[PDB]
Amino acid sequence: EAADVERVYAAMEEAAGLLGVACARDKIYPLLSTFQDTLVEGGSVVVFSMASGRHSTELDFSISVPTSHGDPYATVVEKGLFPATGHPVDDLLADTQKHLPVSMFAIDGEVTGGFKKTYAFFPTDNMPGVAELSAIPSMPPAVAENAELFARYGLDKVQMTSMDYKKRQVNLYFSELSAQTLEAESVLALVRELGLHVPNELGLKFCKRSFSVYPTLNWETGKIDRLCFAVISNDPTLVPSSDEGDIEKFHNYATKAPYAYVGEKRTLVYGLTLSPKEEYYKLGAYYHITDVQRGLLKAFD
């Protein structure tokens, strides 16, 4: 429906406007049109995310895509929206759906850059482990090379994976995390092994509240690029930052970002990302939600 495309895009501009970011329609409209059938409210998920520091001048969007519509990356490449990297990443999404059960897909882009990634959701009652994932031919070798470490910290079940075709990186979204894993002692030990920024008390408190944790890996080396802790909540003041600027900006976004599910509070997903020399903050304000998010809020918020 051409109507849904316009509705979604307008909302995207609205979310971007709050951050002072302009949307490149030539890069966005073509993509929304291609997946116009998924933009229908009901069982669709759409998120508009902001980030601090370096990525403060950008705005990302995530749109769920049912598997019934077919491999999303095969679609964008075939439609000439994105060029094949020529690397294993081009086959990872196809191989994943070829080796494991995928319950849903998702496309991810940036308002000025365009399409950049896809997601592969697995059945909650049948999520793969690190072993099954590392077996995928096109999966980064780093996944297998970090299997022991993951097990040592209770990172086993993965609710989904994402592929960034531009940076050639893979995220593993671990789920069903144990309290032990999120303990301050466990978190510090983990970050130290990965050589990442050491979170302070505020950061540690956020980690403990996390419902999901995801490391980013690459095909070049076996070193994890970064690790992100995600918290889902209806609370608009959870940004784990001591910066007056972040406190104000994230709160503004969390209370004004567009959303269609009027009748309920805005679903928000905050992220604390730790990189080798620093940490930055993220916040996804959901424009479309489903029972999945509703269930997560009841369980972790």
> Residues 175, 262, 283, 12: is their CA dihedral positive or negative?
positive
Q: In the chain, how many H helices and how many E strands?
A: 12, 10
162 binds ligand FLV (CB under 6 A): no
Residue 47 is a binding residue for ligand GST (CB under 6 A): yes
Binding of ligand GST by 64 (CB under 6 A):
yes
Nearest one of 254, 229, 235 to 301, comparing CA atoms: 235
Which residues are within 8 A (CB) of 148 and not within 5 positions of it... i.e. 6 or more apart? Answer: none
Name the minimum Å distance from CB 185 to ligand GST: 25
Q: Which is nearer to ligand GST, 62 or 181 (CB)?
A: 62
Give the nearest distance from C-beta 285 to Mg ion in angstroms: 13
Of 6-45, binders to ligand FLV (CB under 6 A) are: 45
At residue 56's C-alpha, the angle toward residues 296 and 11, to 5°, is: 60
Residue window 249-288: x/- pattern of binding to ligand FLV, with contact defined by CB under 6 A = --------------------x-------------------
60: annotated binding-site residue? yes
3-class SS letters over 146-170: CHHHHHHCCCCCEEEEEEECCCCEE
11 or 296: whose CB is closer to ligand FLV? 296
Q: Give residues 258-287 in contact with ligand GST (rule: CB under 6 A).
A: 271, 282
CA atoms within 13 A on the CB side of 123: 5
- Helices 25-34, 2-19: axis angle to 10 degrees equals 140
Chain residues that interact with ligand FLV, rule: CB under 6 A = 45, 159, 173, 175, 212, 214, 230, 269, 292-293, 296
Question: Residue positions in the annotated binding site for Mg(2+)?
Answer: 60
